[PDB]
Design an enzyme around this catalytic site. Structure first.
Site, PDB file in Angstrom:
ATOM      1  N   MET A 174     -37.680 -24.954  22.165  1.00 49.40           N
ATOM      2  CA  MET A 174     -36.525 -24.033  21.975  1.00 49.40           C
ATOM      3  C   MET A 174     -36.934 -22.616  22.311  1.00 49.40           C
ATOM      4  O   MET A 174     -36.180 -21.865  22.921  1.00 49.40           O
ATOM      5  CB  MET A 174     -36.106 -24.080  20.494  1.00 49.40           C
ATOM      6  CG  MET A 174     -34.872 -23.228  20.366  1.00 49.40           C
ATOM      7  SD  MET A 174     -34.112 -23.238  18.701  1.00 49.40           S
ATOM      8  CE  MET A 174     -35.413 -22.363  17.903  1.00 49.40           C
ATOM      9  N   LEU A 228     -28.236 -19.197  21.825  1.00 47.69           N
ATOM     10  CA  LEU A 228     -28.140 -20.248  20.873  1.00 47.69           C
ATOM     11  C   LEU A 228     -26.671 -20.502  20.462  1.00 47.69           C
ATOM     12  O   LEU A 228     -26.168 -21.633  20.475  1.00 47.69           O
ATOM     13  CB  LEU A 228     -28.990 -19.824  19.665  1.00 47.69           C
ATOM     14  CG  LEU A 228     -29.402 -21.069  18.937  1.00 47.69           C
ATOM     15  CD1 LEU A 228     -30.801 -20.884  18.333  1.00 47.69           C
ATOM     16  CD2 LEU A 228     -28.292 -21.230  17.919  1.00 47.69           C
ATOM     17  N   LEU A 287     -25.199 -27.670  20.246  1.00 46.99           N
ATOM     18  CA  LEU A 287     -25.544 -27.394  18.865  1.00 46.99           C
ATOM     19  C   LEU A 287     -24.362 -27.149  17.996  1.00 46.99           C
ATOM     20  O   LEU A 287     -24.409 -27.400  16.766  1.00 46.99           O
ATOM     21  CB  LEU A 287     -26.348 -26.101  18.800  1.00 46.99           C
ATOM     22  CG  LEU A 287     -27.655 -26.124  19.538  1.00 46.99           C
ATOM     23  CD1 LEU A 287     -28.439 -24.898  18.992  1.00 46.99           C
ATOM     24  CD2 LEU A 287     -28.409 -27.450  19.273  1.00 46.99           C
ATOM     25  N   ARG A 292     -35.407 -23.038  25.733  1.00 46.43           N
ATOM     26  CA  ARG A 292     -33.995 -23.229  25.788  1.00 46.43           C
ATOM     27  C   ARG A 292     -33.314 -21.868  25.670  1.00 46.43           C
ATOM     28  O   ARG A 292     -32.354 -21.621  26.384  1.00 46.43           O
ATOM     29  CB  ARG A 292     -33.530 -24.162  24.653  1.00 46.43           C
ATOM     30  CG  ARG A 292     -33.355 -25.537  25.127  1.00 46.43           C
ATOM     31  CD  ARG A 292     -32.866 -26.576  24.122  1.00 46.43           C
ATOM     32  NE  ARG A 292     -33.770 -26.762  23.015  1.00 46.43           N
ATOM     33  CZ  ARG A 292     -33.417 -26.649  21.754  1.00 46.43           C
ATOM     34  NH1 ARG A 292     -32.122 -26.506  21.371  1.00 46.43           N
ATOM     35  NH2 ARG A 292     -34.377 -26.756  20.886  1.00 46.43           N
ATOM     36  N   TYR A 293     -33.843 -20.971  24.805  1.00 48.48           N
ATOM     37  CA  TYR A 293     -33.000 -19.803  24.431  1.00 48.48           C
ATOM     38  C   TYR A 293     -33.733 -18.440  24.628  1.00 48.48           C
ATOM     39  O   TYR A 293     -33.117 -17.419  24.283  1.00 48.48           O
ATOM     40  CB  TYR A 293     -32.521 -19.847  22.973  1.00 48.48           C
ATOM     41  CG  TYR A 293     -31.737 -21.121  22.709  1.00 48.48           C
ATOM     42  CD1 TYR A 293     -32.042 -21.894  21.663  1.00 48.48           C
ATOM     43  CD2 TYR A 293     -30.687 -21.511  23.572  1.00 48.48           C
ATOM     44  CE1 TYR A 293     -31.341 -23.144  21.430  1.00 48.48           C
ATOM     45  CE2 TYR A 293     -29.981 -22.667  23.330  1.00 48.48           C
ATOM     46  CZ  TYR A 293     -30.320 -23.456  22.264  1.00 48.48           C
ATOM     47  OH  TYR A 293     -29.704 -24.649  22.051  1.00 48.48           O
ATOM     48  N   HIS A 348     -38.519 -29.400  10.040  1.00 51.88           N
ATOM     49  CA  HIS A 348     -37.161 -28.779   9.991  1.00 51.88           C
ATOM     50  C   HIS A 348     -36.119 -29.841   9.670  1.00 51.88           C
ATOM     51  O   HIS A 348     -36.111 -30.932  10.195  1.00 51.88           O
ATOM     52  CB  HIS A 348     -36.888 -28.188  11.375  1.00 51.88           C
ATOM     53  CG  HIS A 348     -35.701 -27.211  11.416  1.00 51.88           C
ATOM     54  ND1 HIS A 348     -34.385 -27.568  11.151  1.00 51.88           N
ATOM     55  CD2 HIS A 348     -35.676 -25.895  11.791  1.00 51.88           C
ATOM     56  CE1 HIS A 348     -33.589 -26.505  11.372  1.00 51.88           C
ATOM     57  NE2 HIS A 348     -34.349 -25.472  11.740  1.00 51.88           N
ATOM     58  N   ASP A 356     -47.945 -22.497  15.749  1.00 52.44           N
ATOM     59  CA  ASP A 356     -47.268 -21.608  14.807  1.00 52.44           C
ATOM     60  C   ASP A 356     -46.001 -21.017  15.378  1.00 52.44           C
ATOM     61  O   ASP A 356     -45.862 -20.798  16.586  1.00 52.44           O
ATOM     62  CB  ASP A 356     -48.239 -20.482  14.398  1.00 52.44           C
ATOM     63  CG  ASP A 356     -49.171 -20.919  13.328  1.00 52.44           C
ATOM     64  OD1 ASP A 356     -48.715 -21.503  12.321  1.00 52.44           O
ATOM     65  OD2 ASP A 356     -50.393 -20.719  13.485  1.00 52.44           O
ATOM     66  N   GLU A 387     -41.147 -20.892  11.420  1.00 52.40           N
ATOM     67  CA  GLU A 387     -41.141 -21.848  10.299  1.00 52.40           C
ATOM     68  C   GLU A 387     -42.456 -21.852   9.547  1.00 52.40           C
ATOM     69  O   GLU A 387     -42.446 -22.147   8.338  1.00 52.40           O
ATOM     70  CB  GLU A 387     -40.959 -23.281  10.841  1.00 52.40           C
ATOM     71  CG  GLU A 387     -39.539 -23.600  11.383  1.00 52.40           C
ATOM     72  CD  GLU A 387     -39.425 -24.989  11.946  1.00 52.40           C
ATOM     73  OE1 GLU A 387     -40.179 -25.925  11.527  1.00 52.40           O
ATOM     74  OE2 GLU A 387     -38.519 -25.165  12.839  1.00 52.40           O
ATOM     75  N   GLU A 445     -41.493 -18.821   6.929  1.00 53.60           N
ATOM     76  CA  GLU A 445     -40.883 -19.635   5.907  1.00 53.60           C
ATOM     77  C   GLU A 445     -41.895 -20.275   4.972  1.00 53.60           C
ATOM     78  O   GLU A 445     -41.851 -20.016   3.778  1.00 53.60           O
ATOM     79  CB  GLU A 445     -39.876 -20.628   6.528  1.00 53.60           C
ATOM     80  CG  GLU A 445     -39.108 -21.392   5.456  1.00 53.60           C
ATOM     81  CD  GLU A 445     -38.170 -22.441   6.085  1.00 53.60           C
ATOM     82  OE1 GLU A 445     -38.141 -22.586   7.361  1.00 53.60           O
ATOM     83  OE2 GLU A 445     -37.468 -23.124   5.257  1.00 53.60           O
TER      84      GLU A 445
END
Ligand SMILES: CC(CCC(=O)O)[C@H]1CC[C@H]2[C@@H]3[C@H](O)C[C@@H]4C[C@H](O)CC[C@]4(C)[C@H]3C[C@H](O)[C@]12C
Ligand SMILES: CC(CCC(=O)O)[C@H]1CC[C@H]2[C@@H]3[C@H](O)C[C@@H]4C[C@H](O)CC[C@]4(C)[C@H]3C[C@H](O)[C@]12C
Ligand SMILES: C[C@@H](CCC(=O)O)[C@H]1CC[C@H]2[C@@H]3[C@H](O)C[C@@H]4C[C@H](O)CC[C@]4(C)[C@H]3C[C@H](O)[C@]12C
Ligand SMILES: C[C@@H](CCC(=O)O)[C@H]1CC[C@H]2[C@@H]3[C@H](O)C[C@@H]4C[C@H](O)CC[C@]4(C)[C@H]3C[C@H](O)[C@]12C
Ligand SMILES: C[C@H](CCC(=O)O)[C@H]1CC[C@H]2[C@@H]3[C@H](O)C[C@@H]4C[C@H](O)CC[C@]4(C)[C@H]3C[C@H](O)[C@]12C
Ligand SMILES: C[C@H](CCC(=O)O)[C@H]1CC[C@H]2[C@@H]3[C@H](O)C[C@@H]4C[C@H](O)CC[C@]4(C)[C@H]3C[C@H](O)[C@]12C
Ligand code: FES
Ligand code: FES
EC number: 4.98.1.1
Lengths: 359, 359
Positions: free
Chosen positions: A12, A28, A34, A100-101, A199, A276, A279, A283
Site C-alpha cells: 500500500m 486512498l 476500498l 498503491r497510494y 491489521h 516497520d 502499525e 500503534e
C-alpha cells in the site's frame, strides 16, 4: 545488461514525509476497491484534508514519515542479487516498487517496466496473506492500468499473490521471536504470552469471504510449530477505526485484559507485514506499549523486530520468485476463486487477466 | 486384567432418540459455561420445552436421532485395541464416554472411572480445535464434579485438550476429500470449489479471545497442503442462530453466493468434528445440499464422508494418547493462557486443576 525479468513489489505504501500525508489519504479515499462514499469526488479530498493533521502528527511521533520505501528497496536489492545467481536464464532481474497510494505508484512502475522492455513481469505482493483489500486492490490496479491506457501488455505477466506459509518467512518470524524472548528478564521468559497481531478487517469484509483471517491464522500456526509451542499465544487484530464491527479480539483490549488478569509479560508479533511502518512504530510501540501498557501496569511488553533488512528475508523473497519462475504458474489456485459474496465486478476481470496470460 | 488407564472421550453429545431431545436441551440451557440467562433456573426448562418440537422434527428428518454415540463407541473400541499393543506399560486401557448434555454424562463417566480404580485418567476432547464453548465446557465439568462432590480425585488426571494439526487427522480429512472429488463427474473435478465448514461462534465469543477460529484455520491449511492446493477453497461457518452477530461467512450464504457467481460444483468439508451428527446429516445434507442448492441451481454439491469408523482415525486417536503418555504432559501450553477477556471465574480453576496435577 538490459533487464529481462521485472519483479514488481506491491504494497500500500506510506507517506515518506509529512508533506506526503494529504495525497496518500486522497488517493486512498478515491479508491472504490476500498470504499464507496456518497459524492465521492467531493468527500474524498475533504476527508483527506480533515484527517491530514492527525495522521501527520502520528508520523511526526515516529520520526517524520514511514520507512517502508527504505525497507522495500533494501529487500528488493538483496532479492535481485540472489535471483541473478539462482536464475541465470531469466537474468538480469530488476525490482520495481509499486505502492498503491504513494509514489512510486503502481501505474508509474508498470510504465517503467514497459519502457525498460522486459520480457517478463511478476506482480509480487509484499503481503504474505491475501486480502481483497490489500493484494486484491494492488492486482486490480495492474488490470485497470492496461484497461485505462487501452493497450495490451508488452510483457508476460504472472503473480505471486500470497505466501502465508513460506518456510523461510516462517523461520524469519520464529528467529525474531526467539531473539526477543531473550530480551525479557530471564525469570519472566516462561511467563511471556505472545500476542500475534495483524491489521483487522471490518466484519462486512470478513463475512463476504475475504481469505485473509484464515491465511494469517495459518502463518501463526506454522510459526508456533517451529517454536515447539514454547509459550502460549493468541492471534488478535489491530487498527480498527470507526463505529462499525470489525474482527476481534482487538490488540489494545487484549493487552489490557491480559494485564487485568495477571499476565503482565507480553510479546507482540506483527504477523501480517514484513517491515516497520505506522502499525508497528506508532500503534504497537507508542499507543499500546508506551501509553496503554503503562496505564494497565504491565511488567514487560516487547515487540519482535520487523523483518526489515534481515538477509534471510531477502533469501525468502528470492526463493519465492525462483520457485514461481520454475513452476511456470501464473497465480495461486486460490486466486481462481473469488469471494463467495464478492460484489465488486473488477475482481473477476483481474482474476482473468492473470489466469489468461500468455505462457 | 483390572483397567489401568482410562481415556475419557469428551463431546457435547446428541439425543439418541426423539424422546431424549427435551432433556438434552434442558441440560444445555442450565450450563453457565455456555451461557448465562436471566432467571436461568426458570427459563432453561421453558426454552427446552419451546424448542423440543422443532429439534425433534430435525432429528426425525435424519432417521430419528443422533449417531454420535455409535461412532464414538466404535472409535473408542478401536483406539483401546491399538493402545493395549502400543503402550503395554499403561495397559489395560479402557475408554469412557463423557457427553456434556446426554447420557452417559461427563459426571457419570468420572464416577465409573473412580469406581474402576484406575491409576490415571486422560480427558481427551473429541473436538480437535479448542473453543471455550466446547472443550473448555467439558473440562470445566471435570473440575466442577470434584468441586461439587467435595473430594479430591483418586486417579492422576491430564488432558489432551486440542489437536488441530495432528498428522493422521489431516490425512483422514485429505483422504475423504480425494474420495469425494472422485465422485464428481470427471470433467467437473478441477472446477470443484471446496468449502470447509465449521460451527460458527457468536462475535462476542470470538472477540473475547476464543482460540477456535485460528485453530480451525490451521486445520484447513494443513489439509490443503496435503492436497497440494488441488482445488480452491474457503473456510466458512455454519449453525448461527438468533439475531446477534456471529463469525461469517455463513455456509448457506456462501453456497448460494457461489452458485449465483457461476461456481456450481461445490464440495463441503465439515472440518471441526469427527463423526456425523445433526450438523452434517440435517443442516448440510438436507437444509443446504437438498433445499438451498436446488433452489439456486447447483450442478453438483457433495460432502466429504465424516471420519466415523475409518480405522486410520482410530489410529490417530491411539497415536494421540500414546504421544501424550510418553511426553508426560499434563495439558497443552495453550491451556495455560485463558482468553484475554475471559469473564468466567471457573476457567482459571479448571486450568489450575490440570496444571497442578501430581506427576
Ligand atoms: C455514509 C458513509 C459511508 C458509506 C458507507 O458506509 O456505505 C460515511 C463514511 C465517511 C463519512 C463522513 C466522514 O466521517 C467525515 C464527516 C464526519 C461528520 O461527522 C459527518 C459528515 C462526514 C462527511 C461523514 C458523512 C458520512 O457519515 C460518511 C461519508
Ligand atoms: C435477555 C437475554 C439474554 C441476556 C443476555 O444475553 O445477557 C435473552 C436470551 C434468550 C432470550 C429468551 C429466549 O429467546 C426465549 C423467549 C423468546 C421470546 O420471543 C421472548 C422471551 C424469551 C424468554 C427471551 C427473553 C430474553 O430476550 C432472553 C432471556
Ligand atoms: C479497513 C480498510 C480498508 C477497507 C476495507 O478493508 O473495507 C483499510 C485499508 C487501508 C486503511 C486506511 C489506511 O491505513 C490510512 C488511514 C490510517 C489511519 O490510521 C486510519 C484511517 C485510514 C484511512 C485507514 C482506514 C482503514 O483501516 C483502511 C481503509
Ligand atoms: C453458540 C453456542 C454456545 C455458546 C456460546 O458459544 O456462547 C453453541 C454451543 C451449543 C449450541 C446449541 C446446541 O447445538 C443445541 C441447539 C441446536 C439447535 O440446532 C440450535 C439451538 C441450540 C440450543 C444450539 C445454539 C448454539 O449454537 C450453541 C449454544
Ligand atoms: C475514519 C474515517 C473518517 C474520518 C472522519 O470522520 O474524519 C472513515 C472515512 C471512510 C471510512 C471507511 C469507509 O466508510 C469504508 C469502510 C466501511 C465499513 O463499513 C467500515 C470500515 C470502512 C473502511 C470505513 C472505516 C472508517 O470509518 C473510514 C476510513
Ligand atoms: C435460539 C434461542 C432461543 C429460542 C427461542 O426463543 O425460541 C436462544 C436461547 C438462548 C440463546 C443463546 C444465549 O443467549 C447465549 C448466547 C448469547 C449470544 O449473544 C449469541 C449466541 C447465544 C448462544 C444465544 C443464541 C440463541 O439466541 C439462543 C440459543
Ligand atoms: S471482494 Fe474478494 S474477490 Fe471480490
Ligand atoms: S472464556 Fe476462554 S478461558 Fe475463559
Amino acid at each position: 545488461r538490459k533487464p529481462k525479468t521485472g519483479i514488481l513489489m506491491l504494497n500500500m505504501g506510506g507517506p515518506e514525509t509529512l508533506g506526503d500525508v494529504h495525497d496518500f489519504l486522497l488517493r486512498l479515499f478515491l479508491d472504490r476497491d476500498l470504499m464507496t462514499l456518497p459524492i465521492q469526488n467531493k468527500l474524498a479530498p475533504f476527508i483527506a484534508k480533515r484527517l491530514t493533521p492527525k495522521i501527520q502528527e502520528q508520523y511526526r511521533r515516529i520520526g517524520g514519515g514511514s520507512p517502508i520505501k527504505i525497507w522495500t528497496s533494501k529487500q528488493g536489492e538483496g532479492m535481485v542479487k540472489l535471483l541473478d545467481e539462482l536464475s541465470p536464464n531469466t537474468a538480469p532481474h530488476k525490482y520495481y516498487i509499486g505502492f498503491r497510494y504513494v509514489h512510486p505508484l503502481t501505474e508509474e512502475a508498470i510504465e517503467e517496466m514497459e519502457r525498460d522492455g522486459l520480457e517478463r513481469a511478476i506482480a509480487f505482493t509484499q503481503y504474505p496473506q491475501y486480502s481483497c483489500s490489500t493484494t486484491g486492490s494492488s492486482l486490480n490496479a495492474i488490470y485497470r492500468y492496461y484497461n485505462q491506457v487501452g493497450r495490451k501488455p508488452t510483457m508476460k505477466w504472472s503473480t505471486i499473490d500470497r505466501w502465508p506459509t513460506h518456510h523461510l518467512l516462517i523461520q524469519c518470524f520464529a528467529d525474531a521471536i526467539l531473539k526477543e524472548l531473550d530480551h525479557f528478564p530471564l525469570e519472566k521468559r516462561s511467563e511471556v504470552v505472545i500476542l500475534f497481531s495483524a491489521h483487522s478487517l471490518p466484519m462486512s469484509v470478513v463475512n463476504r469471504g475475504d481469505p485473509y483471517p484464515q491465511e494469517v491464522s495459518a502463518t501463526v500456526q506454522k510459526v508456533m510449530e517451529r517454536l515447539e509451542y514454547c509459550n502460549p499465544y493468541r492471534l488478535v487484530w489491530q487498527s480498527k477505526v470507526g463505529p462499525m464491527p470489525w474482527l476481534g479480539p482487538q490488540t489494545d483490549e487484549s493487552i489490557k485484559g491480559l494485564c487485568e488478569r495477571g499476565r503482565k509479560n507480553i510479546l507482540l508479533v506483527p504477523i501480517a507485514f514484513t517491515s516497520d511502518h505506522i502499525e508497528t512504530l506508532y500503534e504497537l510501540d507508542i499507543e499500546y506499549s508506551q501509553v496503554l501498557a503503562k496505564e494497565c501496569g504491565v511488567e514487560n511488553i516487547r515487540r519482535a523486530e520487523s523483518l526489515n533488512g534481515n538477509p534471510l528475508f531477502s533469501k525468502a523473497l528470492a526463493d519465492l520468485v525462483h520457485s514461481h519462475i520454475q513452476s511456470n504458474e501464473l497465480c495461486s489456485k486460490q486466486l481462481t476463486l473469488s469471494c463467495p459474496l464478492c460484489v465488486n465486478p473488477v475482481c473477476r476481470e483481474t482474476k482473468s487477466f492473470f489466469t489468461s496470460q500468455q505462457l
